[PDB]
Structure 1
Amino acid sequence: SQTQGIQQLLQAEKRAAEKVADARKRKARRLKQAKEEAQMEVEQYRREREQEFQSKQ
């Protein structure tokens, strides 16, 4: 363990850090997607209410 065992522990902690970084990046991308897609849904329903506004006119 003096050479390779401690290295295995260290690189396993590196893999844990890699997983944490991946999950953080996934969360950030997920929320940017959330912003964009929700803006698109609001835009679509906005088109719907525009057309209904013309109909009311």
Structure 2
Amino acid sequence: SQSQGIQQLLQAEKRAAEKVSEARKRKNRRLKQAKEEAQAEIEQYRLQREKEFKAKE
């Protein structure tokens, strides 16, 4: 009987702590990736503007 309730409450704490903590860690990673990928796309746009300017020059 009571062991299923013990397992439910121990699993409740584990899931509610871990799933939220993994998503918080993902949020930080996605934000860092936004800066990195934005800069990489900015460098590609800069390289295009420079190649375009060389064709004028």
Short-chain TM bin: 0.7 to 0.9
4+ residue runs over 6 A deviation = 1-4
Aligned residues: 57
Which amino acid is 2:13 matched to?
E
For 1:54 and 1:5, locate their aligned partners in 2 and report how far apart those are by CA, in whole Å: 72
Deviation at 1:5, TM superposition (A): 3.3
Deviation at 1:4, TM superposition (A): 7.1
Q: TM-score, normalised by structure 2?
A: 0.77
Which amino acid is 1:46 matched to?
R
Unpaired runs of 5+ residues, structure 1, are none
Unpaired runs of 5+ residues, structure 2, are none
Tell me, yes or no, if structure 1 residue 31 matches structure 2 residue 31: yes
Identify the residue that residue 53 of structure 1 maps to in structure 2: 53
Calculate the aligned-residue CA RMSD, in Å: 2.0
Q: TM-score, normalised by structure 1?
A: 0.77
Deviation at 1:18, TM superposition (A): 0.5
